[PDB]
Design an enzyme around this catalytic site. Structure first.
Site, PDB file in Angstrom:
ATOM      1  N   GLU A  11       0.786  -1.194   0.000  1.00 38.04           N
ATOM      2  CA  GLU A  11       0.000   0.000   0.000  1.00 38.04           C
ATOM      3  C   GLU A  11       0.824   1.253   0.000  1.00 38.04           C
ATOM      4  O   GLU A  11       0.365   2.236  -0.455  1.00 38.04           O
ATOM      5  CB  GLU A  11      -0.938   0.015   1.218  1.00 38.04           C
ATOM      6  CG  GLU A  11      -1.953  -1.138   1.197  1.00 38.04           C
ATOM      7  CD  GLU A  11      -3.006  -0.954   0.152  1.00 38.04           C
ATOM      8  OE1 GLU A  11      -3.749  -1.795  -0.157  1.00 38.04           O
ATOM      9  OE2 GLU A  11      -3.024   0.168  -0.461  1.00 38.04           O
ATOM     10  N   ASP A  20      -6.360   6.562  -5.225  1.00 35.51           N
ATOM     11  CA  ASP A  20      -6.273   5.083  -5.428  1.00 35.51           C
ATOM     12  C   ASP A  20      -5.826   4.856  -6.839  1.00 35.51           C
ATOM     13  O   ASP A  20      -5.964   5.752  -7.679  1.00 35.51           O
ATOM     14  CB  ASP A  20      -7.706   4.445  -5.681  1.00 35.51           C
ATOM     15  CG  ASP A  20      -8.258   4.017  -4.417  1.00 35.51           C
ATOM     16  OD1 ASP A  20      -8.800   2.961  -4.230  1.00 35.51           O
ATOM     17  OD2 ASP A  20      -8.024   4.935  -3.525  1.00 35.51           O
TER      18      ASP A  20
END
Length: 164
Positions: A11, A20
């Protein structure tokens, strides 16, 4: 290696609101804030989440706090879900981390729809399941990450992350 180290590699860490792979507003270690297109909506969710006026930016400290909650939530969602818990309980320690990673990224719901793959993991047919998981939107959209998760389910070792 542990689930936290693993997700932190997948991440990354960002202290400012960001989008994102999907275009959604996120912050920290993959903490989705909103699927809504306004930064203003995002900002508001942000402040709600941290309990202060953040103006779009958080400390490391706060990022890790969110991260701790998000990991806890993923595990709890696996346990609450009959289909998920079943496979979870059947798996070894390393492969359990691979399932947690999927749930964190995609939510309980998303993973629960991987019906056939879940079935194969349960049966311990590692090679077959790795081939089935790759036939997905998930794999085509985030290939390098999906493939690390997949190698993890395939081998039961942390080798895919050794590199990284």
């Amino acid at each position: 290696m542990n689930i936290f180290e693993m997700l932190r590699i997948d991440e990354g860490l960002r202290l400012k609101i960001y989008k994102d792979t999907e275009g959604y507003y996120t912050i920290g270690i993959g903490h989705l804030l909103t699927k809504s297109p306004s930064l203003n909506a995002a900002k508001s969710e942000l402040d709600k989440a941290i309990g202060r006026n953040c103006n779009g930016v958080i400390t490391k400290d706060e990022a890790e706090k969110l991260f701790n909650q998000d990991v806890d939530a993923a595990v709890r969602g696996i346990l609450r879900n009959a289909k998920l818990k079943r496979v979870y309980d059947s798996l070894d320690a390393v492969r359990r981390c691979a399932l947690i990673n999927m749930v964190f990224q995609m939510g309980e719901t998303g993973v629960a729809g991987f019906t056939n793959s879940l079935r194969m993991l349960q049966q311990k047919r590692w090679d077959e399941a790795a081939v089935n998981l790759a036939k997905s939107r998930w794999y085509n959209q985030t290939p390098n990450r999906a493939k690390r998760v997949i190698t993890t389910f395939r081998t039961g070792t942390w080798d895919a992350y050794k590199n990284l």
